[PDB]
Design a protein around this ligand. Structure first.
Ligand SMILES: CSC[C@H]1O[C@@H](n2cnc3c(N)ncnc32)[C@H](O)[C@@H]1O
Ligand SMILES: Cn1cc(-c2ccc3c(=O)[nH]nc(C[NH3+])c3c2)cn1
Lengths: 297, 625
């Protein structure tokens, strides 16, 4: 339960009932740490005092994701993957396990279909599959030749997941295969997002600001800088939210055409999460310590 | 006593981190001066106006700590050679920003990665930073033995890894370093931080880094094996490399997290100490010249110059050398005086160049153990050393020794000698003009007289050593040819270098020279089969000499007189490095030229490519007669 929270906001994820999860990192100053926050009232964030729960981490928070309804999986600068869990009262955030298995900053993390395993990517060029229950690494893969920029688990297949790296590879994974990785046919890819309603369809953005629709090609120049994240909306015909280092947020339709544009952020836009309650509301966080609530038409 | 450091990419607080590192036993710490994830914009709004501070305050450590304990690391997002223009511009500004902050902190070294093939722009920005104020700060290029692409798991179904041998391909990382430093014009501030992988490459790949300025070796914890007791260790192949690196006194860097969580973290470091303690320590000769490695010295000219006192002292601190002289004289006395004449036949020995008398005493000890009679002459033109000889002669030797303060080429001997003994040889055998001196003294040697040494031969071997090339390059002087430093030999204890072929004989001289038409000029062509890819920087020089029959002196590596301290190898550099492919032949040409005043060497490389003739007409280097 810490008073102040780090300037650089890195992640923001809604859960079922609507409580907002926040991951922050101190990327400058004397102490380079991170924190985790829960706002049952999203409009009160990022105000530290009006939060439901919070805790400080030893290092920064490069990425995180929900694990069910009370679990938080964190990718730490320390090279460790951490799992924190809310108590029964949801007033304390307690560390469940902290394993130092990567040799560099853990940059991306994603929970698989079953919700019992997760995949993490790091700058050590490794990708690891985790058994969240046993708190051990099931498999360690060195398929890339550079930093692993992003790993995204398949929505419904528990053995499938994507990964992209600065080696200019987009790898489709299926651990059911002897050789689990497969290269999917430019500028370096930087972000991945499966389609929620179509099995073999995903989108990926590159370092040059282009978003591409790929099947197991359609593309549009959406941003002027690196595409940091891609989040589909929960609608039946989903919209595509794209955030970039150009400090802007864009909302695209089925053909990657722009329907909305927001420049409310004054720094990098680091994450976007759709509200499960109000499907037209879209929340974004950035390194400008802003938590903006967008109403998408 | 290994100098080791800890490499981290995550520092929540400097004061706490530095303390934990020092308590674990490390000497320094590699850490980022800016947060590794704190990407920064320099051109486009609004992100360029991000309110500071941009990083930690310098007040968190003392100047002494920044100067001696911290090694900066370039932020990993900085890609000056990106194909996206916007990213290049930002990386350039960010690279200058971080480098300048490193110089601001007075850091002793800064770490930059060579993780791809094209680092042209990266080199330009660095070179620009180097030419922005003169500083001594070092830049360690982090380059792996094996490229990550060449060690990835074979787990991509539609993109299998190569299974056939690609000889040059497996050396690609060295090409990364070579091109980078060449672009930077061999800046003395740019060194190598060689990163070691879990699987080592072929020997030729490792040997490629012979002679390169390796300042640090990076050891990831993931390459460490676990022994029975849970401790971390290394395979016998990795231990072989560590030993080779300890001979280079590199600084070892431990990177990665602790995977042997059962043990504490100083375990990795304690193992390095364990390996350092386990090795053959300074074996006399290695204890003799441990501070002289790759130290360039001017070759002595005992003829033209009068040697100082302590210079003769170095000559005399080598008992094995003179006991070989004693044996050579001993054998010669027995062969010339049969037992029945041991009381009537007095042999006239003449030490030509007696210095302070070590050869005189060696001759006396030889006559005693051989039970023969000798009359000694001690010839020495250095009048200062003649002072030592005449005090010796009065206090000890007595009438048996006659000191002659004269040049052996002008001295009018009162009689002729049965044996002349001389130590006029340099590292390159004749580079002190022993042939010319012994030629002039030849008239007062009996018709059946013996010369010790009886013959000597010089050897040459092409070597690669960018380190020594740079040192020579750094020998420019104000008022002479700016390239004269490449046209003269240096006596040096060759250390960080790679011998590219077996030494072959160059010049040979015999004494006495009965020949009627004496000409000490020489012209020799040599062809060196090279079975590796490399860069030629010069030729090492050694010599062999026959004192008598089977008693010999040699600094040639394959026939090195065991236990002898005297004479380091000589080095003949070349102005421009020459690339040599595996299987190519290196053709070098050497001349021994002379006029009435001076003697000198001229050398040239004719294959695979032609170099310029070095030291033509002795313009840059001559040996005074
Ligand atoms: C032990 S190093 C060679 C010794 O021989 C001496 N020396 C060299 N050349 C001559 C010479 N031409 N005549 C007499 N002594 C010489 C040198 O002064 C030196 O002391
Ligand atoms: C820099 N530099 C040193 C020497 C050197 C070293 C040792 C001996 C020696 O032990 N005996 N004699 C001689 C010369 N003849 C000598 C010369 C030559 N250049």
């Amino acid at each position: 339960a810490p008073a102040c929270m780090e300037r650089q906001l890195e992640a923001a994820r809604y859960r079922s009932d609507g409580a907002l999860l926040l991951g922050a990192s101190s990327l400058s100053g004397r102490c380079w740490a991170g924190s985790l926050w829960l706002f049952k009232d999203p409009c009160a964030a990022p105000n530290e005092g009006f939060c439901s729960a919070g805790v400080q981490t030893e290092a920064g928070v490069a990425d995180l994701t929900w694990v069910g309804e009370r679990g938080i999986l964190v990718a730490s600068d320390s090279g460790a993957v951490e799992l924190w869990e809310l108590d029964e009262n949801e007033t304390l955030i307690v560390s469940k396990f902290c394993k130092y298995e990567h040799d560099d900053i853990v940059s991306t993390v994603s929970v698989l279909s079953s919700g019992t395993q997760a995949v993490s990517g790091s700058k050590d060029i490794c990708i690891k599959v985790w058994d969240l229950a046993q708190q051990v690494v099931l498999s360690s893969y060195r398929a890339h030749a550079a930093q692993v920029t992003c790993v995204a688990a398949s929505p419904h297949k528990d053995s499938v997941f994507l990964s992209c790296s600065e080696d200019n590879r987009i790898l489709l994974w299926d651990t059911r295969c002897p050789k689990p990785a497969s290269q999917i046919g430019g500028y370096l890819p930087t972000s991945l997002a499966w389609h929620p309603q179509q099995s073999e369809v995903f989108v990926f953005g590159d370092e040059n600001g282009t978003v591409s629709l790929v099947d197991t090609v359609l593309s549009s120049a959406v941003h002027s800088q690196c595409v940091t994240g891609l989040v589909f909306s929960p609608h039946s015909v989903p919209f595509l939210a794209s955030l970039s280092e150009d400090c802007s947020l864009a909302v695209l339709d089925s053909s990657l055409s722009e329907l909305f544009r927001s420049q409310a952020h004054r720094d990098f836009v680091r994450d976007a999460t759709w509200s499960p309650l109000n499907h037209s509301l879209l929340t974004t966080v950035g390194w400008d310590h802003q938590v903006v609530h967008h109403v998408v038409p | 006593r290994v100098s080791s450091g800890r490499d981290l990419n995550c520092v929540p607080e400097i004061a706490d981190t530095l303390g934990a590192v020092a308590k674990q036993g490390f000497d320094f710490l590699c850490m980022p001066v800016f947060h590794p994830r704190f990407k920064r914009e320099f051109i486009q709004e609004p992100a360029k106006n991000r309110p500071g501070p941009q990083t930690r305050s310098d007040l968190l450590l003392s100047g002494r700590d920044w100067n001696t304990l911290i090694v900066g690391k370039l932020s990993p997002w900085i890609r000056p050679d990106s194909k996206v223009e916007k990213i290049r511009r930002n990386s350039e500004a960010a690279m200058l920003q971080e480098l300048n902050f490193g110089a601001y902190l007075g850091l002793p070294a800064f770490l930059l990665p060579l993780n791809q093939e094209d680092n042209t722009n990266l080199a330009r920005v660095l070179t620009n930073h180097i030419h922005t104020g003169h500083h001594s700060s070092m830049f360690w290029m982090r380059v792996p033995l094996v490229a990550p692409e060449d060690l990835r798991d074979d787990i991509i179904e539609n993109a299998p890894t190569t299974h056939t041998e690609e000889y040059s391909g497996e050396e690609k990382t060295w090409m990364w370093w070579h091109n980078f430093r060449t672009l930077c014009d061999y800046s003395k501030r740019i060194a190598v931080a060689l990163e070691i992988g879990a699987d080592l490459p072929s020997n030729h790949v490792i040997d490629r880094w012979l002679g390169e300025p390796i300042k640090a070796a990076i050891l990831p914890t993931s390459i460490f094996l676990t022994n029975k007791k849970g401790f971390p260790v290394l395979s016998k192949m990795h231990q072989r490399l560590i030993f080779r690196l300890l001979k280079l006194e590199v600084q070892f860097i431990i990177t990665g997290t602790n995977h042997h969580s059962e043990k504490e973290f100083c375990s990795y470091l304690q193992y390095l100490e364990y390996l350092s303690q386990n090795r053959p320590p300074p074996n006399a000769y290695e204890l003799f010249a441990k501070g002289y490695e790759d130290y360039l010295q001017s070759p002595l000219q005992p003829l033209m110059d009068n040697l100082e006192s302590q210079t003769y002292e170095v000559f005399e601190k080598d008992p094995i050398k003179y006991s070989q002289y004693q044996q050579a004289i001993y054998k010669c006395l027995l062969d010339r005086v049969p037992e029945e004449e041991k009381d009537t036949n007095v042999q006239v020995l003449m030490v030509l160049g007696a210095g302070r008398g070590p050869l005189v005493n060696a001759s006396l000890r030889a006559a005693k153990q051989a039970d023969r009679r000798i009359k000694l002459y001690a010839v020495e033109k250095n009048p200062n050393a003649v002072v030592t000889l005449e005090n010796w002669q009065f206090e000890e030797w007595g009438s048996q020794v006659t000191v002659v303060s004269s040049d052996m080429r002008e001295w009018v001997a009162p009689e002729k000698a049965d044996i002349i003994v001389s130590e006029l040889l340099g590292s390159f055998a004749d580079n002190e003009l022993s042939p010319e001196c012994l030629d002039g003294a030849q008239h007062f040697l009996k018709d059946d007289g013996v010369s010790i040494p009886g013959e000597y031969t010089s050897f040459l071997a092409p070597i690669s050593s960018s380190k020594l090339y740079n040192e020579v390059r750094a020998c420019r002087e104000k008022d002479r040819d700016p390239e004269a430093q490449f046209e003269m030999p240096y006596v040096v204890r060759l250390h960080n270098f790679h011998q590219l072929s077996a030494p072959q004989p160059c010049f040979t001289f015999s004494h006495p020279n009965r020949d009627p038409m004496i000409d000490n000029n020489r012209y020799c062509t040599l062809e060196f089969p090279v079975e590796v890819n490399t860069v030629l920087h010069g030729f090492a020089g050694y010599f062999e000499t026959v004192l008598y029959q089977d008693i010999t002196l040699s600094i040639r590596p394959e026939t090195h007189s065991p236990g002898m301290f005297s004479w380091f190898p000589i080095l003949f550099p070349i102005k421009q490095p020459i690339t040599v492919r595996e299987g190519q032949t290196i053709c070098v040409r050497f001349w021994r030229c002379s006029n009435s005043k001076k003697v000198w060497y001229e050398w040239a490389v004719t294959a695979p490519v032609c170099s310029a003739i070095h030291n033509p007409t002795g313009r840059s280097y001559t040996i005074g007669l």
